[PDB]
Amino acid sequence: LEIPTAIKPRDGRFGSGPSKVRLEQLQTLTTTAAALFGTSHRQAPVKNLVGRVRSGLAELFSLPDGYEVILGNGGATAFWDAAAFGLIDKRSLHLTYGEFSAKFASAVSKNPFVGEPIIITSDPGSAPEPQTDPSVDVIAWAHNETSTGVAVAVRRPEGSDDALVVIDATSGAGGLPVDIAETDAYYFAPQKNFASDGGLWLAIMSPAALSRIEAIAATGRWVPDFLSLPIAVENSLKNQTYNTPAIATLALLAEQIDWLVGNGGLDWAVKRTADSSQRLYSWAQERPYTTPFVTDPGLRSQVVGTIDFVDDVDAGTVAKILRANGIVDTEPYRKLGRNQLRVAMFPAVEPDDVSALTECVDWVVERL
Amino acid sequence: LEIPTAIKPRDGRFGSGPSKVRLEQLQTLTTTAAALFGTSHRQAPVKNLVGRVRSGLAELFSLPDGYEVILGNGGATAFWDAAAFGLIDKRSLHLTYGEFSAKFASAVSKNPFVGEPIIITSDPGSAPEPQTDPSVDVIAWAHNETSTGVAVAVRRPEGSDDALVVIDATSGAGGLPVDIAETDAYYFAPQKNFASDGGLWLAIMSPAALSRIEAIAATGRWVPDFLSLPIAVENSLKNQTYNTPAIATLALLAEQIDWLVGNGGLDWAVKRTADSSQRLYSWAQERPYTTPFVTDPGLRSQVVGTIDFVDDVDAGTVAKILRANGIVDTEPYRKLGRNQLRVAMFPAVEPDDVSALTECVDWVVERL
Ligand SMILES: Cc1ncc(COP(=O)(O)O)c(C=O)c1O
Numbered sequence: 001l002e003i004p005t006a007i008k009p010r011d012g013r014f015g016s017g018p019s020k021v022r023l024e025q026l027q028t029l030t031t032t033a034a035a036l037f038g039t040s041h042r043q044a045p046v047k048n049l050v051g052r053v054r055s056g057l058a059e060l061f062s063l064p065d066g067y068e069v070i071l072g073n074g075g076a077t078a079f080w081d082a083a084a085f086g087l088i089d090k091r092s093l094h095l096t097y098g099e100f101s102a103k104f105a106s107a108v109s110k111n112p113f114v115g116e117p118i119i120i121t122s123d124p125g126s127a128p129e130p131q132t133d134p135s136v137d138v139i140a141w142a143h144n145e146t147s148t149g150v151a152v153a154v155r156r157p158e159g160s161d162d163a164l165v166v167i168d169a170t171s172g173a174g175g176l177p178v179d180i181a182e183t184d185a186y187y188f189a190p191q192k193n194f195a196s197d198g199g200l201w202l203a204i205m206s207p208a209a210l211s212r213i214e215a216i217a218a219t220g221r222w223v224p225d226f227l228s229l230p231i232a233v234e235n236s237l238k239n240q241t242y243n244t245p246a247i248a249t250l251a252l253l254a255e256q257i258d259w260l261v262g263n264g265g266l267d268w269a270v271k272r273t274a275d276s277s278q279r280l281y282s283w284a285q286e287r288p289y290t291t292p293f294v295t296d297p298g299l300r301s302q303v304v305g306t307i308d309f310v311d312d313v314d315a316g317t318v319a320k321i322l323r324a325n326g327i328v329d330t331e332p333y334r335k336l337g338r339n340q341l342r343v344a345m346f347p348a349v350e351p352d353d354v355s356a357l358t359e360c361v362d363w364v365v366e367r368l
Numbered sequence: 369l370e371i372p373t374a375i376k377p378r379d380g381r382f383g384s385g386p387s388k389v390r391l392e393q394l395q396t397l398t399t400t401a402a403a404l405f406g407t408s409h410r411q412a413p414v415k416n417l418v419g420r421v422r423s424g425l426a427e428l429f430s431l432p433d434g435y436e437v438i439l440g441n442g443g444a445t446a447f448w449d450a451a452a453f454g455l456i457d458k459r460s461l462h463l464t465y466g467e468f469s470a471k472f473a474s475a476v477s478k479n480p481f482v483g484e485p486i487i488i489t490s491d492p493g494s495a496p497e498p499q500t501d502p503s504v505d506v507i508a509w510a511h512n513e514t515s516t517g518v519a520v521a522v523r524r525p526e527g528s529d530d531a532l533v534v535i536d537a538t539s540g541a542g543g544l545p546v547d548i549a550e551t552d553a554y555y556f557a558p559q560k561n562f563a564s565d566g567g568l569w570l571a572i573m574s575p576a577a578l579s580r581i582e583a584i585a586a587t588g589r590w591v592p593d594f595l596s597l598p599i600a601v602e603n604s605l606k607n608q609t610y611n612t613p614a615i616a617t618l619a620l621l622a623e624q625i626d627w628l629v630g631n632g633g634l635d636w637a638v639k640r641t642a643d644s645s646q647r648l649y650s651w652a653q654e655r656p657y658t659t660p661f662v663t664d665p666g667l668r669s670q671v672v673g674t675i676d677f678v679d680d681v682d683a684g685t686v687a688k689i690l691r692a693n694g695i696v697d698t699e700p701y702r703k704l705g706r707n708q709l710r711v712a713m714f715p716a717v718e719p720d721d722v723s724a725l726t727e728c729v730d731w732v733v734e735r736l
Pocket residue numbers: 243244245384385442443444445446468510512513514536537538539557566567
């Protein structure tokens with residue numbers, strides 16, 4: 001099946017990380033950023049680039065006093081292990097409702113430097129309510145569960161005074177609203193809403209989280225240096241990382257932050273993803289062969305939309321035909337095992353392209 | 369001081385990592401690799417890119433049967449912690465003679481999952497001989513010590529049958545000769561001879577090293593998943609990494625590998641760095657205000673040249689003037705504390721630009 005060009009989106013990338021890298025943003029690598037490549041991360045030109053990223057994120061996320069942008073190599077998966085060693089003192093409570101929220105709880109359960117976590121589960125497509133427990137000093141959940149398309153509210157739970165709020169915003173940060181004052185560690189990686197590459201983690205940390213990192217280091221608890229949050233904080237405060245970061249990753253990230261801030265900031269990004277996701281969900285509701293996987297509209301992610309298909313319409317065949325027509329990465333999370341499409345709607349994704357995608361899906365399904 | 373343009377090198381980047389990224393190599397990001405950006409690392413287009421990197425390195429390093437290219441996020445610093453958990457069974461022997469060889473031994477000493485390492489030290493600017501011990505199952509040293517400009521032979525020591533040869537080739541791999549059959553783990557990162565970005569580690573592993581990784585995993589020894597060599601092996605064998613890799617790091621690396629292979633492979637790269645380094649060392653010998661830091665010519669690195677300056681010629685002032693004229697990153701290793709310049713001569717660096725640099729240094733020194 002050859003989809004007519006007239007109905008095709010301008011950009012066919014609907015992947016949930018890595019995701020659409022804007023043409024003008026990628027072009028900065030051979031132009032405005034060409035002179036930064038291959039230069040020292042211990043010298044002013046690359047340190048100023050890290051500085052642009054940190055102050056840019058501080059502006060975009062309206063950071064309260066004493067909050068800091070901390071960064072290091074590895075991506076969000078490395079941050080899970082760094083946080084298990086460095087942020088959790090004795091015990092944590094985790095909400096699990098998909099791949100990424102479950103994987104952080106599983107990393108904490110296996111880590112022999114911290115206690116057995118309390119795990120509150122819910123079926124995929126749903127989420128438990130943010131909650132606390134008197135025996136925990138960390139409470140963790142994902143702002144956006146990328147495998148299921150579920151977005152959860154980011155609020156400091158009642159009676160959680162003695163616990164840090166540790167939020168995996170890998171696919172949520174930059175596309176969803178957030179009051180950073182409600183968090184202690186709001187972490188992410190650049191390949192989703194920030195339209196950059198993986199291999200770097202970023203974490204917005206509160207004064208309580210920074211003090212906690214210092215207090216845990218002061219106990220003498222061992223941590224491999226690569227996963228050390230005290231070393232990552234020491235370096236981040238001076239526009240550096242512990243080891244050599246990727247200049248391309250920082251250059252693409254800084255360009256996306258500038259673009260988001262220049263468009264009106266987080267409020268603009270949230271309006272944009274609301275617009276894209278409204279097009280996707282309204283279409284999924286209208287068509288008799290589709291339905292949103294997430295039944296609670298309050299949990300339906302603005303940035304990652306999981307659309308279930310009925311028995312007689314094979315979503316896998318639809319995804320294959322779309323891919324053969326250059327409309328890529330609509331395949332559901334590889335481990336979920338559902339007759340579903342997963343569509344990313346991060347701010348780089350044009351809302352009109354989400355509309356064009358739905359028309360392409362209708363066109364293909366009518367010819368199956 | 370304004371250095372006349374006629375004597376300036378075409379490219380002023382002499383940094384030892386990050387290092388000179390060729391422009392035509394950087395331009396593939398906006399052309400032949402542009403469509404790869406923002407696409408899934410779990411789908412064929414990015415998996416084929418990893419495939420190109422693995423096959424390319426297999427060709428460049430003339431890999432014997434059963435040797436495999438393993439990769440993961442983090443850079444070489446992450447590989448030290450991954451190797452301490454995953455390659456060392458009971459005890460290791462380390463050679464230390466600068467920043468990077470010492471830091472790996474220090475990471476192993478602090479790791480509470482393995483024994484206390486045997487450490488064989490030498491003064492900076494020198495190196496101990498590769499040697500073994502009956503109580504160790506791993507012997508480790510750096511092919512190239514980036515902090516002192518010392519290159520060491522890579523050979524399997526006599527009577528080391530029960531020990532894996534674990535070589536930190538971060539600044540050596542692709543610019544220095546090597547017989548891979550003499551190694552069990554030959555690891556590096558892409559920001560030096562491979563003219564790409566940091567944040568990714570690569571390791572050429574022997575069948576004995578791969579079997580060792582499996583045997584250590586089979587004991588049930590815990591390892592944080594991000595630093596897991598069994599998981600990195602499982603993913604690498606199917607052109608993947610454990611978590612999201614940077615597409616730009618892979619795309620720049622594959623272009624450099626292709627450029628090196630097309631030029632005549634490792635033999636061509638070694639001739640090129642021999643040519644560049646001959647220009648630097650002969651000039652350092654000729655001038656009465658300079659001398660190579662490394663007194664043993666057999667240990668003088670072809671890729672990283674440390675040139676000491678006499679008391680009355682301030683190398684720091686020279687470095688500052690060069691930097692103000694766009695000739696950057698000649699500053700010595702930040703912790704060495706010597707009146708010295710450090711010049712990288714990786715294959716992307718044109719030998720004529722090393723000659724031009726020496727003329728620029730003469731010009732500046734004559735006007736101090
Ligand atoms: C020899 C050597 N080993 C290890 C490293 C650490 O590399 P990375 O910053 O990629 O972790 C470096 C960095 O310069 C190095 O030159």
